[PDB]
Write a protein that binds this ligand. Sequence first.
Ligand code: ARG
Ligand code: ARG
Ligand code: ARG
Length: 692
Amino acid sequence: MADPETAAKFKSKNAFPDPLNDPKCNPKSLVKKYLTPKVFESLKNKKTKLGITLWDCINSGVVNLDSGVGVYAGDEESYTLFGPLFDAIIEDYHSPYKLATGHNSDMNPAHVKAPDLDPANRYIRSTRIRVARSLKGYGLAPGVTKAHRLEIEKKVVGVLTSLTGDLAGKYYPLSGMDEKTRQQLVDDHFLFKKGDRFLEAAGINKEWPEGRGIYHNNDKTFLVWLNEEDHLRIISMEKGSDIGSVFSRLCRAVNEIDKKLGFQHTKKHGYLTSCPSNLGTGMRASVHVKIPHAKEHPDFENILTKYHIQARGIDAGVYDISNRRRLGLSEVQCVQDMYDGVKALMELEKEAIAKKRSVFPEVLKNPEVKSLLRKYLTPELFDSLKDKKTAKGISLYDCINSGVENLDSSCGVYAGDEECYTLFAPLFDKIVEDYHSPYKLANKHTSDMNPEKVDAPNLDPEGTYIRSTRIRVARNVKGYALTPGLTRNERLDIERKVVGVLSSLTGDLAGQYYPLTGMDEATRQKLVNDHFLFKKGDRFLEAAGVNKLWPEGRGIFHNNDKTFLVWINEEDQLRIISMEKGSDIGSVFGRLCRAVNEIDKQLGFQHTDAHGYLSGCPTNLGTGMRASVHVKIPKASAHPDFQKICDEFHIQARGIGVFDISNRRRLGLSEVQCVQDMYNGVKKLLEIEKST
Ligand SMILES: NC(=[NH2+])NCCC[C@H](N)C(=O)O
Ligand SMILES: NC(=[NH2+])NCCC[C@H](N)C(=O)O
Ligand SMILES: NC(=[NH2+])NCCC[C@H](N)C(=O)O
């Protein structure tokens, strides 16, 4: 509801803005509240050295009557010259701050004591810190000249492009930006466009888009908007909870710019901004956190009040926590209040969950729940294990959570790390030996990725019966938790290490990596069509803690021949797939071993004598293998020796007359033995399909 036509009538006469007395005007409007006829008369003929008038400052609030604030400062002098208006607006908006009290700035990140709150990402989803700043020697955004805006861009870009380490990146000016770059910044949510009706009426859109630009570091955890609403809008942000690191990164960039260029800053106002709402710290610090139980707690609102923070919607139970204050507290204090506030809120969520988890899951008492979880989790077993935690902080309840939340689970138990299989052995042993029957853990498991130990002459080089051959192995990188118990930095380290290895793959294994984070739709559809794409895990994986921080750290690798595929950090940290059209099981497995053995040599896999290769899902232990053969068999299908064969070789057929022959077992036999069995069995199914 912008009416610049009406406002211009009064502005060109330098007369009092009668629209402020329109009943349509926001009752809460600070310009309406404090621009009285006497204030107008007293200041209407005054100008700053940059020629800024009272009408220039109040115009947006007159054009846009729904304005909450409704004034912008054209320059520093505006804050003093039109003081009778600005002081009143500032001390209202920033109550209880008084200009007489003075403001204290502090951008030393060492003053902040913020041990990482939630590395495991159990509650906090993301952290963000923004500051607004303006350079010394120029007007503010509504008043800055055409040449000065350009000079500001030149000076800022000079500093930003000299940034090293995690702050290193690239500047993208808006002027002359091409279509592809524009689109990329849109996908990253880094792009800004021409100012809205509030900025327009403030004169901020002058010379658009000249002098405007966007800078971001390579990690995309640092962003600068140049010459938008203020000279600088500087943002440090990332997934997870590490606000101390976020703030430190922010300070290192801001202090350098300060060092080289200098900011507009006063004792009374702190850092000067176009909108008086952004004075003082110029800061908006925020955290996304899931605290559905904290909201109902009687101390919830007292915590927010105590730390001068606020909680709003953004995802169920997820709140955007942010600061309320900018004047009267330093930037360090804002961050510290934020840390302490979020910490207090999280602890409330933790208490409620702990209490709920202190007792046997009542829902497991329904005798119609037929999960292996229900079968083996006796109340006695529960009480005996409920108070133990792995070195990585995994509880029994973390392990059984998915089977509790999803009662229709077949199994319902996941391991958060290797230690779970031992620390919670009384549960896991029973589940492993049930699902992987007849395997016993005392038997132990033998891995074997030597493809030469497989004797597999090509069964059908024609292509008559066997349409395709596929062999997958699930693996997890040694030195880390399992998927459900991964911290943010572990997952990122795994992606980095794995991609590093995969990029060095030469020959027929050479390919490229496609991360899910920042994937454009074209690349996506390309992958979908090759059946290479995976998506967020279902409710079972969600409840197990697998989907944390999706899609960060997830990605896809394939070779140029479309015969080798790697999924990174999906259900397991590594899903490695070898595949060919035709029947050459031997070739497929040989390619698989070459890739897996090399990754093994460089990184190492999680593995035990008793469980073979470790996975967060107990069903994927041992070989962690699925060997698959798309075949056409009705003759042998109907043959009375079908059973004897499919049972002698531990294989199984399902239809998708195309059938899917896959292996039954994963523990108690090596990868070599599993492949040989598949060959030996599919062979016999062909030595009937072929007969006459
Ligand atoms: N981006 C901002 N400066 N927002 C605060 C002021 C917004 C608008 N001028 C108003 O008075 O409601
Ligand atoms: N804490 C976060 N992850 N914030 C991201 C959201 C950014 C968005 N501009 C906002 O409304 O704040
Ligand atoms: N047999 C394996 N694939 N082991 C993977 C890990 C590397 C090494 N054998 C270790 O246990 O530390």
